[PDB]
Amino acid sequence: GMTILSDVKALGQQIWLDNLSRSLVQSGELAQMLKQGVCGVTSNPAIFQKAFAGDALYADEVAALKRQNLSPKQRYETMAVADVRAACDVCLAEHESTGGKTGFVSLEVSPELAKDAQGTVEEARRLHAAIARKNAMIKVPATDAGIDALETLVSDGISVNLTLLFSRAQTLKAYAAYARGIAKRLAAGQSVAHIQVVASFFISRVDSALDATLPDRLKGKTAIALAKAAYQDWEQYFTAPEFAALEAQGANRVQLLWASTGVKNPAYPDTLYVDSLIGVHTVNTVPDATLKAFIDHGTAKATLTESADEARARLAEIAALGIDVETLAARLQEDGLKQFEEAFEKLLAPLV
Structure with a gap:
């Protein structure tokens, strides 16, 4: 039932909607979702490609923008920034009610x-200024350059959603860059309490990559095991004395955000990823259909930290089989960037 979103909040996890469109906001649907337990919104180029192609409310906006001397990219940005600013306004009451901890749009x-x-x-600085809302996050892929940029943006006071993470090592590197940016601001006497960062760690794409060649006892288990180990890494990093010294001065921890949590293999229950990854101080962003499956027959239980020993044993067997999850992670990040660029080029062509 609908109350499950509130039950998950009580377990310490926010549920965000992994979709955005002009009609989602204009219809009042997003505002109703935020009253019913949805706590934020994520977008990406594929989400916008599908929105621009299918949502009737873009037609008049595109016709207006084609009357102006603008590049296809600027036409896209005008549309997307407008959607994000409208969604931010819908989510602002939620964001302010928690002291800026929730109600983000990426x-x-x-x-x-x-x-x-x-x-x-x-x-990122430009889009942050263009949206002009305290609850907007700029979404940046977690390549090496993206972790360089993260440190700078954090030091500039900008909230960031670091995406396309598939690697525990790369995630730890992101935490270290965040901490350096926070340390810089504290040394300069600048505020840190409103800077929020999430680390979007992808789930289904790991199982999609491996399951066809895995032994039976591991099919559909690797992505969840990797996420559970990542969360243990998170507990260790942020409770250590080094970070505690920053949190004592007002720094917020980075939070893990489970992405790609729609189930892509019909052999697995449609709520597998949401049900399996609930833990305190985390986020899960879900597509519409997964949100409705979770409301209908999901389960709210603190599953993320259960049986961490078995997660470790599974990752040890994955390595025994010759699967290097760090090599896989780099490939999946590369593939995701190629896929996002393909979607971006597909959405720009009708805006020429």
Whole structure:
């Protein structure tokens, strides 16, 4: 039932909607979702490609923008920034009710900047200023350049959603960059209490990559095991004395955010990923259909930290089989960037 979203909040996890469109906001649906337990919104280039293609309310906006001397990218940005600012306004009461801990809307920078740290910083600062809302996060892929950019953006006071994480090692590198940016601001006497960062760690794409060649006792288990080990890493990193010294001064922990949590294999229950990854101080962003499956027949239980020993044993067998999860993670991040660039080019063509 609908109350499950509140039950999950009580277990310490926010549930965000992994979709955004002009009609979602204009219809009043997003506002009703925020009253019913949804706590935020994520977008990406694929989400916008599907929204622009299918939502009737973009037609008049595109016709208006084609009357202006603007690049396809600027037409896209005008549309997307407007959707994000409208969604931010819907989510602002929630955001302010928790002291700025919830109610975020994420907008991703152009995929072509993913390996350009300076260009990423410049675009992120610009989009942050263009949206002009305290509850907007700029979404940046967790490449090496993206972790460079994260440190700078954190030091600039900008909230960031670091995405396309598939690696525990890369995630730990992101925490260290965050901490360096927080330390910089504290040394300069600047505020840190409103800076929020999430680390979007992808789930289904790990199982999609491996399951066809895994032995039976591991099919459908690797992504959850990797996430459960990542959360143990998170507990260790943020409780250590080094970070505690920053949190004592007002720093917020980074939070893990489970992404790609729609089930893609019909052999698994449609709520598998949401049901399996509930723990305190985390986020799960879900597509519409998964949100409705979870409301209908999901289960609210603190599952993320259960049986961590078995998660470790499974990761040890994955390595025994010759699957290097760090090599896989790099490949999956690369593939995700190619897929996002393909979607971006597909949405730009009708805006020429």
